Subunit: 340 residues, 3 copies
């Protein structure tokens, strides 16, 4: 909600309180999304100041407060800063920002990350260019310097992040994306390559000294209709765990497909149908193994712009004999969202 | 403070900075409330949107930021989300909300939780239905569907919470409350029963497979006078620790009494007199043992609605030979509160 | 940004998102400030209510959210409450506040804590009276009860803080400061002494049962010019670590000097030149050893009151043969700040 706007500076303080619950049989250990209370809340700010006609500065921070922990020792479980960056936009020259933000490849995966509760399975966090990462400098150009309506691109420089964990670490890398949007249609290509750290390399699964990820996307967004499709692949970048051996590392190779179809009724009901499948290839020891594979049926109902509720149903296609131990049960999510 | 209100959506951003200090002799280990700096702050939001004349959506999140930790390793000690839920209210049909909220039995104990700094000893956190708990779905009806002025009730469904700790865990359960308020008078009955988890059962103290708690309350609230009284009992629900043996679990049985009397002077001074006593019965090994037993004398002075200060004095009646090791010394709290 | 102001209560919600990066050769282990992403954000509130013409209540809380952590286990690294206190100001009698706040000696060191990114090396946290500490009651008088324009003083009572760490602990103590400001000129004297805890005393480095710190400051602040100088000393108060032996404790004695010179161009560029040197004396085993020693060249450019960017360059004068293992390499910080 825009709580401030004077002297060319507008601050938008936003947040949401999400009562959420997952239903999966068993202890949800073998299900797709787990089971039980998953209530959480968000608080963030978006600032933007007009330094003059052509120049605009801006910043953004968003935090995630888990609402399903006790007031005991576990209170902070899952709490984190999702985004934190500052930047400048200049006329038709482009924008530049630095901090914790979205890797460029997500310019592609963003297409199908529209399910009510699940979806976007491939957009992992602290996983190079696919989701939110720390220390990224991103330059974005829109309408090709104002010369070509609808043609945008971006280049991104990822700074090395040597964390205590191979999963949350990365070496230096560069990525870019080019997208074009013409009247309801949108197409995108995104790609990035980076150095893997010593620790990532010391891992049991995955072999290389460079991590790659690229995805293409296609969408039709108009007339209350939303259809979107993504296809991407990766090399030594996707994190995987052998539940049997308790081994971990990265998939040597993966091929990922994501399809989504939705319709927004004028009365507020937005049904959703989706399909996701991500399969790993050449996993040292297993061979080919599915990591994600399901159908999604779900719906969201918007009471207005501040209140909504939804049910998300995952019809897990993963089979019980999956070699990595990936869960095979279904999961149903019911949620009620207040937001401002 | 209501920082936003447009298009039927009002957001109230609230908070407080509490400079606080406890005075108890010794290392406060044997005193009632401990000793030293207890400064803290709160930040939360309350949102409410009018979806139409009869239907209102709302949400709320409140966080506790300890102000007595260092900027070192201990910085987060005591930090937690107190509340986090979203819900809908419909005409005279009732309200429904889900998330981390107050168990129904607190509809009763709320009566005497009015002391300046202490009090409300029996309203424990993550302790079934008495205080704040996670994953509760609560339905509330007011004025009996609009047919009976002053007659309200609630039913609450507690979802199983299997935490790493027996103290912060719970199985499924249901609770309800009925209250009636007629001109300054208010009376309430609240009750809830739930399943105890494997871990709670694996504990040394307390024996059963079901946890119960019920409390009744009576109050006179008018003419600057506030008198309130609670009486409740519990079975295998109250957490207790043998300080000698370092054993823990739940009291097989407890009988709890709470009395409070206060007066609000027109100039801002609100003196307080209270009495609390909670005794455990059949504790495996000890027999009967008091857990809480004191008199309270204290006062609050309101400079206005945003600023206040108070002194809370606990005249601990617990004796030095208390079998569980419960402290016997007094404690004095002085605080200065700014809030918005 | 003042987001609220009605009925004599104004709330100022403020914050900033800082995209930040350090450049130092090697793994920054041997450099002055380290190396890599240092992005962070702040959120805080400042409230002030007019209880009547002479009496004002107020409160303040400020939090630090690191933006360079992952969403994994390390998410909370560096997160902390910087300030949290409430207080009252009365006519010309003075103000009083309690909570986590700035020790009195910082009334002096504040003079030279003006560098773009570094500087203020001696103003440590949870280190008695020099930086932010918990549980301090502070009385401040301005203009000597209104009788002497420009003559102010303060007295501060530090409550014992017995933490799990010798570095973040302290016993009781008192401190004061007197400053005088006449037309662009400002001079200050600050001093405080306190008890060291058992644990601080059980440390390998530093010998005494009392901690002292005093600093004087002098400044010329006018006509776009800012020159400031500090000199202070300490006994058993400055925390130091022998990187070789991995030993720790406090410097028996230190002499600290800080000089700063800056100029604010009308177009927004504020160049900075500074010099800092802190040397420890009588360190058990080493003798005399520099702890901090460098020149600083840096600049900040203000686009407006909400947006800025800067480069801070430390020309480390510490030499590679420094006995404690203090780093000798340079560090360069580049940052882009959005704030409201
Ligand atoms: C505003 C500071 C930007 C700093 C960018 C540092 C990028 C470092 O390595 C990039 C490798 O690609
Ligand atoms: C909006 C989602 C509500 C989900 C409620 C789940 C309740 C589960 O168990 C209740 C047992 O009593
Ligand atoms: C508003 C409460 C203030 C409490 C101040 C306690 C100070 C205790 O010791 C001070 C030693 O110097």
């Amino acid at each position: 909600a825009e709580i401030y706007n004077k002297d060319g500076n507008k601050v938008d303080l936003y947040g949401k309180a999400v009562g959420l619950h997952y239903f999966s049989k068993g202890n949800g250990e073998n299900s797709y999304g787990g089971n039980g209370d998953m209530t959480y809340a968000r608080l963030g700010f978006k600032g933007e100041t007009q330094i003059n006609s052509d120049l605009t500065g801006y910043g953004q921070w968003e935090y995630n407060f888990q609402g399903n922990n006790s007031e005991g020792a576990d209170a902070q479980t899952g709490n984190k800063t999702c985004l934190a960056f500052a930047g400048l936009k200049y006329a038709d020259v482009g924008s530049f920002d630095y901090g914790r933000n979205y890797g460029v490849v997500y310019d592609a995966l963003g297409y199908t990350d529209m399910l009510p509760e699940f979806g976007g399975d491939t957009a992992y966090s602290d996983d190079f260019f696919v989701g939110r990462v720390g220390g990224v400098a991103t330059y974005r150009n829109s309408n090709f310097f104002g010369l070509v309506d609808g043609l945008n691109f971006a280049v991104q420089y990822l700074g090395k992040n040597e964390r205590d964990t191979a999963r949350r670490s990365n070496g230096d890398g560069v990525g870019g994306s080019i997208s074009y949007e013409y009247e309801g249609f949108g197409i995108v290509g995104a790609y990035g390559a980076a150095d893997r750290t010593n620790l990532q390399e010391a891992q049991p699964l995955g072999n290389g000294k460079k991590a790659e990820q690229w995805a293409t996307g296609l969408k039709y967004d108009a007339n209350n209709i939303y259809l979107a499709a993504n296809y991407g692949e990766t090399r030594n970048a996707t994190p995987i765990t052998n539940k049997f051996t308790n081994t971990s590392g990265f998939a040597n190779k993966t091929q990922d497909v994501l399809l989504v179809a939705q319709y927004q009724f004028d009365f507020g009901l937005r049904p959703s149908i989706a399909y996701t499948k991500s399969k790993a290839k050449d996993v040292e020891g297993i061979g080919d193994v599915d990591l994600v594979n399901y159908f999604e049926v779900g719906a969201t109902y918007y009471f207005n712009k501040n209140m909504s509720t939804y049910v998300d149903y995952i019809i897990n296609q993963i089979d019980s004999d999956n070699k990595l131990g990936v869960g095979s049960d279904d999961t149903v999510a019911v949620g009620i969202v207040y937001q401002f």
